[PDB]
Design an enzyme around this catalytic site. Structure first.
Site, PDB file in Angstrom:
ATOM      1  N   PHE A  23       5.846  -1.941  -2.249  1.00 12.59           N
ATOM      2  CA  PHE A  23       6.809  -3.028  -1.981  1.00 12.59           C
ATOM      3  C   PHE A  23       7.647  -2.810  -0.720  1.00 12.59           C
ATOM      4  CE2 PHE A  23       6.446  -2.500  -6.719  1.00 12.59           C
ATOM      5  CZ  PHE A  23       5.514  -3.499  -6.898  1.00 12.59           C
ATOM      6  N   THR A  25       9.001   0.262   2.678  1.00 16.25           N
ATOM      7  CA  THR A  25       8.981   1.531   3.407  1.00 16.25           C
ATOM      8  C   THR A  25      10.410   2.095   3.513  1.00 16.25           C
ATOM      9  OG1 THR A  25       7.097   0.773   4.709  1.00 16.25           O
ATOM     10  CG2 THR A  25       8.358   2.596   5.588  1.00 16.25           C
ATOM     11  N   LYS A  45      15.513   1.099   2.935  1.00 15.20           N
ATOM     12  CA  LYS A  45      14.225   0.561   2.469  1.00 15.20           C
ATOM     13  C   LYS A  45      14.047  -0.839   3.041  1.00 15.20           C
ATOM     14  CE  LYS A  45      12.487   1.183  -1.743  1.00 15.20           C
ATOM     15  NZ  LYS A  45      12.085   0.994  -3.163  1.00 15.20           N
ATOM     16  N   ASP A 137      10.387   1.963 -14.893  1.00 14.70           N
ATOM     17  CA  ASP A 137       9.500   2.751 -14.038  1.00 14.70           C
ATOM     18  C   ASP A 137      10.033   4.149 -13.832  1.00 14.70           C
ATOM     19  OD1 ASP A 137       7.172   3.339 -12.488  1.00 14.70           O
ATOM     20  OD2 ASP A 137       8.049   2.393 -10.685  1.00 14.70           O
TER      21      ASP A 137
HETATM   22  O1  LIG Z   1      16.780  -0.278  -2.848  1.00 14.97           O
HETATM   23  C1  LIG Z   1      16.065   0.424  -3.549  1.00 14.97           C
HETATM   24  N1  LIG Z   1      15.634   1.643  -3.181  1.00 14.97           N
HETATM   25  C2  LIG Z   1      16.045   2.216  -1.956  1.00 14.97           C
HETATM   26  N2  LIG Z   1      15.615   3.358  -1.578  1.00 14.97           N
HETATM   27  C3  LIG Z   1      16.174   3.769  -0.415  1.00 14.97           C
HETATM   28  C4  LIG Z   1      16.990   2.876   0.144  1.00 14.97           C
HETATM   29  S1  LIG Z   1      17.142   1.468  -0.848  1.00 14.97           S
HETATM   30  C5  LIG Z   1      15.615  -0.016  -4.941  1.00 14.97           C
HETATM   31  C6  LIG Z   1      16.643   0.386  -5.953  1.00 14.97           C
HETATM   32  N3  LIG Z   1      16.504   0.106  -7.297  1.00 14.97           N
HETATM   33  C7  LIG Z   1      17.593   0.610  -7.903  1.00 14.97           C
HETATM   34  N4  LIG Z   1      18.393   1.207  -7.006  1.00 14.97           N
HETATM   35  C8  LIG Z   1      17.807   1.071  -5.767  1.00 14.97           C
HETATM   36  C9  LIG Z   1      18.631   1.793  -4.749  1.00 14.97           C
HETATM   37  C10 LIG Z   1      19.966   2.147  -5.499  1.00 14.97           C
HETATM   38  C11 LIG Z   1      19.628   1.959  -7.002  1.00 14.97           C
HETATM   39  N5  LIG Z   1      15.424  -1.448  -4.964  1.00 14.97           N
HETATM   40  C12 LIG Z   1      16.488  -2.401  -5.140  1.00 14.97           C
HETATM   41  C13 LIG Z   1      15.821  -3.707  -4.869  1.00 14.97           C
HETATM   42  C14 LIG Z   1      14.450  -3.438  -4.559  1.00 14.97           C
HETATM   43  C15 LIG Z   1      13.539  -4.486  -4.237  1.00 14.97           C
HETATM   44  C16 LIG Z   1      14.022  -5.780  -4.304  1.00 14.97           C
HETATM   45  C17 LIG Z   1      13.129  -6.859  -4.010  1.00 14.97           C
HETATM   46  C18 LIG Z   1      12.417  -7.765  -3.824  1.00 14.97           C
HETATM   47  C19 LIG Z   1      11.488  -8.876  -3.555  1.00 14.97           C
HETATM   48  C20 LIG Z   1      11.778 -10.111  -4.151  1.00 14.97           C
HETATM   49  C21 LIG Z   1      10.983 -11.251  -4.013  1.00 14.97           C
HETATM   50  C22 LIG Z   1       9.854 -11.092  -3.184  1.00 14.97           C
HETATM   51  C23 LIG Z   1       8.917 -12.289  -2.959  1.00 14.97           C
HETATM   52  N6  LIG Z   1       7.870 -12.371  -3.984  1.00 14.97           N
HETATM   53  C24 LIG Z   1       8.243 -12.032  -5.349  1.00 14.97           C
HETATM   54  C25 LIG Z   1       6.934 -11.907  -6.138  1.00 14.97           C
HETATM   55  C26 LIG Z   1       6.306 -13.301  -6.166  1.00 14.97           C
HETATM   56  C27 LIG Z   1       4.898 -13.141  -6.696  1.00 14.97           C
HETATM   57  O2  LIG Z   1       4.990 -14.031  -7.792  1.00 14.97           O
HETATM   58  C28 LIG Z   1       6.223 -14.032  -4.832  1.00 14.97           C
HETATM   59  C29 LIG Z   1       7.512 -13.811  -4.018  1.00 14.97           C
HETATM   60  C30 LIG Z   1       9.521  -9.872  -2.577  1.00 14.97           C
HETATM   61  C31 LIG Z   1      10.344  -8.743  -2.755  1.00 14.97           C
HETATM   62  C32 LIG Z   1      15.370  -6.062  -4.646  1.00 14.97           C
HETATM   63  C33 LIG Z   1      16.239  -5.000  -4.903  1.00 14.97           C
HETATM   64  C34 LIG Z   1      17.648  -5.283  -5.240  1.00 14.97           C
HETATM   65  F1  LIG Z   1      17.996  -4.868  -6.480  1.00 14.97           F
HETATM   66  F2  LIG Z   1      18.515  -4.677  -4.469  1.00 14.97           F
HETATM   67  F3  LIG Z   1      17.964  -6.567  -5.259  1.00 14.97           F
HETATM   68  C35 LIG Z   1      14.274  -2.032  -4.534  1.00 14.97           C
HETATM   69  O3  LIG Z   1      13.280  -1.387  -4.199  1.00 14.97           O
END
Ligand SMILES: O=C(Nc1nccs1)[C@@H](c1ncn2c1CCC2)N1Cc2c(cc(C#Cc3ccc(CN4CCC(CO)CC4)cc3)cc2C(F)(F)F)C1=O
Length: 269
Positions: A23, A25, A45, A137
């Site tokens: 999803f 990088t 990210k 997850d």
């Molecule tokens: O930020 C994240 N990790 C990081 N690591 C390092 C820096 S930030 C992690 C994360 N989860 C919990 N936490 C964190 C960090 C702190 C605690 N997250 C929060 C996070 C992530 C993703 C999305 C996303 C998305 C997305 C949505 C719709 C489509 C389009 N497609 C939807 C599907 C549809 C198919 O039907 C068609 C349209 C695309 C994408 C949102 C979020 C959040 F919650 F912020 F809104 C994600 O990964």
């Protein structure tokens, strides 16, 4: 002022790529908050797919929840930048993911570190349960290392890892705090095998049938049977019979007081 900062591109920069998943990088970077002077090490990210204004509203609602997480063992979202490919900012966890850490530092990890990680992951999962947040997850790849003594859960903001899923999740897509306990048990098995692959070489399509036959991941070499029994309890078919996170904190905390009684590691006297 704000709990979730809405970032401008000028406030941060990417330094080094850290990894890519399905999803997005993740990059190591630097953030100077608007109106401030301080340089904050961050993880950034960047989502893989560009999103519409409509999709961004769904992201924002979840991002506000992720900014509200406040626990020493859970990563908090600090900011979001609503670029065409959205960028999500957290505090940098400088030692990376725990999966890679245990694989790369296996020869310099003792029983005390391993049992304290189990306590800390249980503490973070108990906070998520208290907040009515189901992870869905949990895995060693989704635990980050702030220091060797301090780990935090992440990447619960995402709602196929069949080999981490409770049987009811596989069969009926039921996800609860008690299916998170099953995944916790797999995560503990990952730690205790220094990041080995669960159900290695076995097709995902076979896993529900193996579990229905009563088969489970094997006792790791370092584990005394007392530790393995906790994993076994996490994989009971009746979800409400599995331990709760609060109970896992108690049991791992007791073991962490005499860690060499519970994990047998050469050189860990
Ligand atoms: O930020 C994240 N990790 C990081 N690591 C390092 C820096 S930030 C992690 C994360 N989860 C919990 N936490 C964190 C960090 C702190 C605690 N997250 C929060 C996070 C992530 C993703 C999305 C996303 C998305 C997305 C949505 C719709 C489509 C389009 N497609 C939807 C599907 C549809 C198919 O039907 C068609 C349209 C695309 C994408 C949102 C979020 C959040 F919650 F912020 F809104 C994600 O990964």
């Amino acid at each position: 002022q704000a709990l979730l900062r809405i970032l401008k591109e000028t406030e941060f920069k990417k330094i080094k790529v850290l990894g890519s998943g399905a999803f997005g990088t993740v990059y190591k970077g630097l953030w100077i908050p608007e109106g401030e002077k301080v340089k904050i090490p961050v993880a950034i990210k960047e989502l893989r797919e560009a999103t519409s204004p409509k999709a961004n509203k769904e992201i924002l609602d979840e991002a506000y929840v992720m900014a509200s997480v406040d626990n020493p063992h859970v990563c908090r979202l600090l900011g979001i930048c609503l670029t065409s490919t959205v960028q999500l900012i957290t505090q940098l966890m400088p030692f990376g993911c725990l999966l890679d850490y245990v694989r790369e530092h296996k020869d310099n990890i003792g029983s005390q570190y391993l049992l304290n990680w189990c306590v800390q992951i249980a503490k973070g999962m108990n906070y998520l349960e208290d907040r009515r947040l189901v992870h869905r997850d949990l895995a060693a790849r989704n635990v980050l290392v702030k220091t060797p003594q301090h780990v935090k859960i992440t990447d619960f903001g995402l709602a196929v890892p069949i080999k981490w899923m409770a049987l009811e999740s596989i069969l009926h897509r039921i996800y609860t705090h008690q299916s998170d306990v099953w995944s916790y048990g797999v995560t503990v098995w990952e730690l205790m095998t220094f990041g080995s692959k669960p159900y290695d070489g076995i097709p995902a399509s076979e896993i529900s049938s193996i579990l229905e036959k009563g088969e489970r991941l094997p006792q790791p070499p370092i584990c005394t049977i007392d530790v393995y029994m906790i994993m076994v309890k996490c994989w009971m078919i009746d979800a409400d019979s599995r331990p709760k996170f609060r109970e896992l904190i108690i049991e791992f905390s007791k073991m962490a007081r005499d860690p060499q009684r519970y994990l047998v590691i050469q050189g860990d006297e």
